[PDB]
Symmetry: D2
Amino acid sequence: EKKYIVALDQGTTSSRAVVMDHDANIISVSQREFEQIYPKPGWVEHDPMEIWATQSSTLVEVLTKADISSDQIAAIGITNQRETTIVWEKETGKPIYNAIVWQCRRTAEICEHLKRDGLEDYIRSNTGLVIDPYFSGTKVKWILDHVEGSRERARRGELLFGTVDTWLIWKMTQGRVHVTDYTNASRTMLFNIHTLDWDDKMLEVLDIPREMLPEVRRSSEVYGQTNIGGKGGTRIPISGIAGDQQAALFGQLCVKEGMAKNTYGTGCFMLMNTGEKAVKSENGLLTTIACGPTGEVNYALEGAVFMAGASIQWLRDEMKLINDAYDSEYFATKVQNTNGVYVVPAFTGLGAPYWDPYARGAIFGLTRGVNANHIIRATLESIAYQTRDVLEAMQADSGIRLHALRVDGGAVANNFLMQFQSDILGTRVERPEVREVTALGAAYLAGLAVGFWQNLDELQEKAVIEREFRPGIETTERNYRYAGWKKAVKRAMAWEEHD
Amino acid sequence: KKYIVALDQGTTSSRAVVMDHDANIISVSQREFEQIYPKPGWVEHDPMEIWATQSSTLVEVLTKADISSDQIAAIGITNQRETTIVWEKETGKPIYNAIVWQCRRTAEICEHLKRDGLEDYIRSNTGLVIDPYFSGTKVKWILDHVEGSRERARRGELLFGTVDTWLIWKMTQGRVHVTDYTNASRTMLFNIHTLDWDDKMLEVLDIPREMLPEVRRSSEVYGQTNIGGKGGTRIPISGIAGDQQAALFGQLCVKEGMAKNTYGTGCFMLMNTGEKAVKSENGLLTTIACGPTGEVNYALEGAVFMAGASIQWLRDEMKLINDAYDSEYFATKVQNTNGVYVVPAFTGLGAPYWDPYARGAIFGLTRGVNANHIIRATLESIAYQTRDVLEAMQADSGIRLHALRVDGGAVANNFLMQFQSDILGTRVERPEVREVTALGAAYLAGLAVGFWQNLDELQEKAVIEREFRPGIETTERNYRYAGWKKAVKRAMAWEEHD
Amino acid sequence: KKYIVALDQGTTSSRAVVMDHDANIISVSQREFEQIYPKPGWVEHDPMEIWATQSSTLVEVLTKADISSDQIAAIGITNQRETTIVWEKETGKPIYNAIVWQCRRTAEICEHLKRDGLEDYIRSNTGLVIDPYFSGTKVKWILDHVEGSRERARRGELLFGTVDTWLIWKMTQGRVHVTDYTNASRTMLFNIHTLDWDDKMLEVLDIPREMLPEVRRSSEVYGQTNIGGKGGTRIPISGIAGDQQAALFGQLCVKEGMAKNTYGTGCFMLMNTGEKAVKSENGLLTTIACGPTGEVNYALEGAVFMAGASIQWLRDEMKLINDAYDSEYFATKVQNTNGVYVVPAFTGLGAPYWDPYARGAIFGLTRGVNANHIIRATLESIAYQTRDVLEAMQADSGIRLHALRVDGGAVANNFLMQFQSDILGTRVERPEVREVTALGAAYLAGLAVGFWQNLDELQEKAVIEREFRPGIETTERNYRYAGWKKAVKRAMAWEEH
Amino acid sequence: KKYIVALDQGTTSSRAVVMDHDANIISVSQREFEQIYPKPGWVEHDPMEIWATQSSTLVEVLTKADISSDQIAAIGITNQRETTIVWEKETGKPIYNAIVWQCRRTAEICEHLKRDGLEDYIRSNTGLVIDPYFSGTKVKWILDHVEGSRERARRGELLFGTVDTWLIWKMTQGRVHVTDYTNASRTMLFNIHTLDWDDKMLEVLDIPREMLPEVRRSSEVYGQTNIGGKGGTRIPISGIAGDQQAALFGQLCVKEGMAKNTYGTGCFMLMNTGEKAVKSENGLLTTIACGPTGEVNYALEGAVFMAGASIQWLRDEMKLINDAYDSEYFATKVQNTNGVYVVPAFTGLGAPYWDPYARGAIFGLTRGVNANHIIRATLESIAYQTRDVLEAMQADSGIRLHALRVDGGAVANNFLMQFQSDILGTRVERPEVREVTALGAAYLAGLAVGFWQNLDELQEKAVIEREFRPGIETTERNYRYAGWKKAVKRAMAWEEHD
């Protein structure tokens, strides 16, 4: 029959495809890296086309390599990099511009007019968001103010707007379906999370043809089908969608209130489930939409960090300093400290809870006797520091201090990081065996919508902490070590020039 | 309806190209698969990874260019020539991994045949030679190695197959089990004359005919694939050729006496000998090629096990380079090799030596010999080897090239190229498009279905990018050549069997 | 006796040159030695190492050119300006490593000196300024550091020295215990007017004057060494000077209004004021230089801590270069820095900032920033700093430089070389020999023993290999520098006092 | 006077060592000098750089340890063995570079000798083999190689000297033109029974007797030196041994049957034949050693041209290793060489082959062979190589060695050591101070001046910092050795005799 479920994981640097069974086991994984584009220092674009091709070709790769047929597939699950924005010709199916990645700082000016006009409170109250270039909203308008006759064609409904989810599905369903999810929508900055519907002022204000928005839907649900050839008569129902950090909250089973995870991908993402109730932050955090225990709408507090595993990949690729992302640890463990150095990975602004799109990355505390290692290690340490940073925003908004931090992601593998991570917070860190929880979540979500599993409790014992790390460092020390960060942090601030 | 796709299963990677009616390369994807070396002298590949990579590629090149399944007239297939796969018909799983054309394991087996005087027959009927390179020994070997296989094989539960064969099967979801003359004539299980399986041979090696695929023309609609898309959207597989043979065809070397040289993982020189199967006294092979129609033709062939693969050895194993075109970079940092010689016999010798017992060697090292000399020499083995066979080639053939037309990946190295000429004393023409191997498979597949009416349609298509002319006097060339022979002798018969 | 030998004791290595009467280099030796960073922001060397290196290079230049001890008319001497040694005259064993001029350890001391109101004196009696750059504190530091030191100090059991001193002492086996002016000018313990140690200062720092050597003139037979060879065989030491001052001299920037920049371990722009001891307004120093005969003169100095060492750091420490010539290679792989700024305050600031709490920093990183961008930014940091001093220079100097005399290893960098022109919006003159810091000392030694008659002979050697000229727009220039200034401000006072 | 200084002029660096009454090392200097290879097979050095570096080191190690001339009881000297220098007596300027012992360049000259029935005579009187290794051929070479040398040399004009000779004479300004037994021995220009220059040889090689220095005893005050310092301070030079014999002696291998192996640029195995000279019917060198008092003694020698030099090659030329000690690291990542063998005949053969025409080579290359297998194979040769001499030696000696007392810097490599053990199926004895060469030269000099009165004094000096026991089956041990032998044989006679 249909014994398998597939999760497409559209990430910021690579596209992935995973394959599970009823037991919730990965049978297969494929992954293809795509290119980053920086046409101006501060900007990041992606080829929607390249987003497509990779995802597709990976989908195939996982099956084909497994000797798995279109028919054994119960359903498709879709997770994606949260905020990147594409817009294309409804006819051609052709994008009228590159995708603008969630990290681009190009709409800073625009954010500025928002600011000026006094939309902060509304936006904050209505969206859970903050005005930063981080969001879809500003980006849309841009491509719009950029492409010559675009607004017209847009109203005339000739142009389409989409998040990565929306783009994958549509290409997937030949153009048939044009939908999006709750989790996704909530990041667009054009969507009212109370109303649960678009937001007129917001559209208004941004000036964006309503004609172009997809349609929000539940996270767990059937939206279409796909024909990926095979035998004929076979169609695969696509029935699960979630902005990736949320999928990862779900995949961790943080379905109840006060439940939180840390995710270490390109960036770092921490989120707490705030239940049926939506908390407003005072600590530089974002209110957003997560998944109830049934795919139903829940609310979350979330703290976003622009640079986590990307920093490492900068060291490898750009800096050519490690010649294996795990070399990182190798190098970093070759020193007992950083010799006073600090790295500030504000490559794409600050973001949280600082929210400083003018901040650029930086190195501090340089002395003649500082070596690469010290730099590598500092770079690692920077991840941890950022975490503590949000982790604190949290307790402050919530009044709870985690007992242990549950994490996940690719970098979690780095035991140096994990340990350090523990040392700095003064908390226990628990590492599972499966750190691809994001794709689990999408699987999970999609499976539900079609029988696959019938309830969360099915999955309740699948997830297991492969490892728990505990702090082996002095408060005093921890504190101290945190003190310089903060100081470095501020110095990173406002580098960039806003006229 | 607007494009044509070629599938190109390389020893090292699976690639897929998109071409239009005017023969343009619209798009390309390339995907790498692991080489497994169970034991030194052995080479395996995984059939599955092969399937995966190749599948993933096809999808990617289309998805990439925003091409719909529905806009593809046909799909052509070219593949690495000798690699053998044996899987269960029933469940579509391999009983063992693909044993590569390079694998030297069947050496013992070859010994037997020799003794049994099989040599004449083999040579005479298959045009081959008794070498571990051909698929024949490989099947048996797997058979011998697989317990109670023969049986099921006999009672037909297992299929035998070369790449094409495995590809197409996977793509017709088991519907068609085919092969073509080019490939068929590489297994050592087929009569190049009687155009069909040789019984003596089938007997001799003991292989149940039950497992052999159907042999067909290289240009003909053999079936359809369903890659998804608009529904009732199905694509015809109408072209099939062994890479070298495809390469040969994509160069429009469809007339008697026309030859090419391909620089790939190894090097394969081929000459079209028209309607006549010319027998090689000189160490070369007689084989099945394509006539201007996809009709059977014969060819003289020189096979050279290592070429560009040496370069990747340096890069990945030896770690000596930062890239393979970085090769030209270091090689030109030096003017000679300081006496150094490289005998890239990582997998036996090959034409015209045929010594599966030869192994890689470097000679004439002195205290001041550095890497560049070493890199430069790797390049030269490439040029040396070619001359060898070429020599064999004019003898046998009777022809005397006024130039050697080339292609393959390595052709971009101008160092290699320039050196090639000089060592040969012949001009060398390097075409604009070095990928003539997918083109051939395209042109085959396309002829099949009315994409192009004829070969003459793609002739004004060819375009020489560069002609390299020799910059040396015989004295040099022979000397350098001299040194070359000496080495060779030194590299043969390293491994033991006794 | 046909050759002259210059001893060159740098912050990184010890060198040794041989010059014929023609003022041609015949040969040279080098020997690197270890930098010790006992602690971030601390820098030290081993007095023996300096010694050792300096010896064997000396034996090697000779030996390798088949030149005999008896052909050598004199020994010139130059050295790294402020590093401090104090040993036991008894045994000749140092009581503590050398405290390198770069070292920041005596920032506390400098602080109380500021508290206690001494700025105005120092700046006035030394023309120095209050930084750990100078010996004064280093001395004090050690004294206070080492147990009953001040005793013996006063007993006459311990000796103090600057490198030239340490050298000359070892060479004469303890017989001579001298130093020149230029060097003395840097201790912050010596009155650039009264031309002699300053009691005030001695007193202010607690330094027995009985550990101090004799201040002498730059060109002057101070003594002789014995290096073996044809018995009775003896060599006179007749030249002494701070590298910088030595460079300045070797460059024949002898008349007032003369300035060169040198590019080594750090950067040092010096302008000859002649007998006029001008007082700095702009953050520069006022020291003692030499006129045409070794006689005293004054100078304005722009002193930059990091320059070639920055590049070294990339090679050896960051391992971003395989060869410090590759430096250009990389830098030129790009067209600009991609918005990056590097601030080489590895060992504090320097002129004209004077910030011992500043620490190296890098700014404006974006994902598309790579190593080349950075290597290039290191180099640019060098060209920047300099405009800074230049600026202050013309400030305090009142004169506007039309061209810049340049020298030292780092100048072989055409890139660096060209960037700098551009950025200054000034021409740049680059000589045929950048070993001018060794020329300098030879010269001085040579004059002393009459190897050479007058400068005028020298002159015709000064040949300009090349000259650069500003490629960028008067605007770019201001826009790049601008970036520079801000980065700077962010590096200041990173260190917690 | 509390110290002694050994000068150790090696093939690739020049060191200088300070020791006391307890013979404790107290300080060290080391300065590398350039290798020069005008042409593949040739090695020259620059008398000047060697001088230049040897001085500096000597001075560097004293100035640094704060030691003045006045504390130096004496100076010993050890040196690279056969490298020849010829220079104008007048000027002290050489008429050519030093021809290193590894240089092959007189190959032909050797050819004539052989062709003239000289083998026996030479072996019989010199204890040597006709090979380009020795001084003899190198002088004529120089002599013929320069227009009017012969003459002047006769007319007084020119001096000839090896490395010991050439240092003392610069160190003494022209005063002493001395050499030692050990040194003389290897010129193949000196009679080992007769203890003097061999008249015929000179005749033969046509060398004016006027250019030779005086032979002296290994431990004896040849003279004095002025390194400056505090007035009327001369230091005495009372010891000279070739590094090998200096290691032998330094080893305390004072009695017959006592042997050691040194691992440095080359590898030298030496057995003390006591007072008598054993003749080699097995390819070893019969040579002059030192008795417990620095007197004439005889020895057997196994000379291996490349060993540690091999590693320098990998590091600076091949580039492959980060620090010459990275070898072990790398070598220990593979548990074997995948069938590879390195035959380090960079400068020809050497005992027990004496193949000047051989060059280095790599056998058994397979696709999956990486740098590591090559690096480890590079080490194993070292070991193989010892086994080669080791056995000759037992055959020649009539002695089955029980343990192998080694020394040299490479001895620092555990791998090498266990390995060595394994393939020997012998226990290896690793000392605690690896500077034995310098110790040997110190003792000699210190003996000569009563710094010590005898060896006994130091019998309890020298320690076994470690013992290595084999851990490998005959079979396989025999097995790998076997691979080695084929490899060797395949390297032989690579180069061509004109």
